[model samples]
Target: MSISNPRIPADLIMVDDFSSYAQGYLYEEIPITQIKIYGEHIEYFDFSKSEINTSIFENCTFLDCSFEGASFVDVVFQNCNLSNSNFTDAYFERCQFIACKCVGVNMIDTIFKQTSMQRSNFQYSYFDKAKMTDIAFEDIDFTEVSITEAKLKRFKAKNSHFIKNNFFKTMLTGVDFTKNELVAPTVSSPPIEFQGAKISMVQAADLIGLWGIIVE
Candidate 1:
């Protein structure tokens, strides 16, 4: 993310890289610069351990896709369905996902910085061992999700659902789940960590199950 030469756009910062490939290019490393991809269905596509820079994915669907160990910088996914996708060991920087469906997705050991997810469905997703720095989960549904042994800081998630999710060993420092519903966010091991998080009294009552106590 440093300064470069004149070839790169001063405003855009990334050069146009769409011409290097045709539409429906499958399982290839992401191009070096910009690529506007819209309205396509891909499957079993692999972008593992690769670097994708400044791409736009709109109205697209990726079924059973794999982005393990890949890196996405300044990317955008709007109105997309990325269900059953795998993003393990991946790194995302300044990326945004708006109105997307990510059901049964896997994001283990992933790193996210300044990433924004709006109105997205991440049901049955896994974020085990992930590192989230300055990320937003606005207007998102995190029901039946798993977030284990993660390092997080500066995350925002208001009005989100935490129904039946497992947050094992992940601290919630300064996190605001004020209006969130914690439908059994209990685990089988250590206590549910809510040290520095903000939540409603209803949520506190709901999470009391972790203490093996009933909330009257």
Candidate 2:
């Protein structure tokens, strides 16, 4: 179904064919409330300055899409491929991203509060000046990603991988990366402070004497 200047009502289910291409769609400053879209291949779509509230997107592929200045509240993205997308200045509150692939994506000045990204892949992504809080990255991979001036508070990354990622001027407040494997990760000179993080006993022991601190 194609729509021009469409105003989707609350609690509407919009199911599109996955085999076909849903391309060249634009949602400018519109409010898509409580809508659910499933099994669609959306490409070249733009949702600038739009608000998506209480929406659920399942099994969808968003290729070469842009969501700049968009706001998502209480939304859920399940098993979606959102690669090669841009979300500059986007606001995500109480949203959940489950098993999503966000590779090669750009998220500058984005806000994520009470958002959970479980089993997601953020490889080769750029997250500059992003503000995140209460987000859990369970079993996610941040390989080859650039995270500069990003603020992370109360973030938990358990059993994740951060291989070859760059962290410069990134603020780590109550953030824990000790439980994850960071293979040869690159950071700026002051070394991305991890002092406020909660670490395991083995991880604490590994860090001991590195800065000449003996722990009993």
Candidate 3:
């Protein structure tokens, strides 16, 4: 573990129990079911390649933990803290995160399906090259988040705030942004490539401003 780890001992140690999850340690490809990992301070541990199903992680804290290549299904994380974690190449299906804090997370190449994120703060997080299908994010704060090269299908984000986000190489075809709040959203184009995308009249004015169109 790095010196930045807050835990006394953040290194992984082999144990004779699956309860090592509480100690912020776990092996590969673990299929956990009907478990509750609430209020556990999982710091600087790796749960990579683990499969979590039918679990509830209420108020759990995961700092600098590596969930790389992990899979989550039918899981719910309520009021959890997953800051500075690595979720690169991970897959999430049928999961919900309510009132969670996930700042500065590495979500490159991640896949999210049938997932719902509500009242979450994902400020300064990375979602480059990620893919989302049938996902709904409600009341989320995506300020300064990177969504470049991200692919979305049936994606719905309601009442979200986006500022300083990069959408380069991200296709917004058929994606509607008129309902959501965009402080300043930049995409690829002078005649912006928001093909079939729905935007507010003010947004249209601002986007056309990129094309050197002046409006009174």
Candidate 4:
């Protein structure tokens, strides 16, 4: 995944009224350090269980925000919009989400390490039971995302798309995703998360036509 770039501190501290500097910390006892929130719009900001360090959210918009169970270290979210935000059980380390849009975000049970989500969109997001390690996703879109029962280690995906994603009972063994773009994803039926995962063959004939298998 090769992700390690979010220790922003080149003399920042330019918080242009992000709800009065997050209301000078009170609820959840916020510990937001090294601030640099630019182009702010921060609506419904609650920042639950806060403790965001080395922050740097550029071109922000974060409507309907929550950041539940927050604790992001060395954070950096550039070109952000983060629609319908609510990072449930959040706790990312060395974070970096550039080119963000994050539609319908919710991130249930989140806990990523050495994170990196480049060119993000995250449509209909909700990484159920998330526990990612050394994460990295380039050119991501993840339409209809749901990542059920997730727990990926060293998960990496380049040129990502993953339309209709669900990955129910996720266990994508040694995930590869064959250069991304796996259409109609919703596994689990002795599919066992695709045994050893590194799919291709035209995405395994679109997942063997969703396991009904009837190809001439």
TM-score of each: 0.82, 0.79, 0.84, 0.34
Ranking by TM-score: 3, 1, 2, 4
lDDT by residue for model 4 over 1-216, one digit each (tens)? 477877777897786687766666745475878888888776887877778789788888978888788788998898989898898998999988899898988989989899888887989888899999888889999999888998898888889898998889888888888888998877766788769878888888867876789665
Per-residue alpha-carbon lDDT of candidate 2 for residues 119-140, written as tens digits (9 for 90 to 100): 8999999988999877777888
List lDDT for all candidates, in order: 0.75, 0.74, 0.77, 0.84
Off by over 4 Å in 4: 1-16, 27-38, 41-80, 83-86, 90-100, 103-106, 110-120, 123-126, 130-146, 150-164, 170-182, 190-212
Q: Which residue ranges in model 1 land beyond 4 Å of their true spot?
A: 1-31, 187-192, 209-216
Span of ten consecutive residues with least summed lDDT in model 1: 1-10
Instruction: Please name the candidate that would achieve the greatest TM-score relative to the true structure.
Output: 3
Candidate 3 wrongly placed segments (more than 4 Å): 1-19, 22-28, 190-192, 209-213
Q: Residue 32 CA error for candidate 1 (Å)?
A: 2.9
State, as a TM-score between 0 and 1, how close model 1 is to the true structure.
0.82
RMSD of 1: 5.2
Candidate 1 clash pair list:
none
Give residue 184's lDDT in candidate 3 (0 to 100). 63
**lDDT, residue 108, candidate 4:** 92
Candidate 3 residue pairs in backbone clash: none
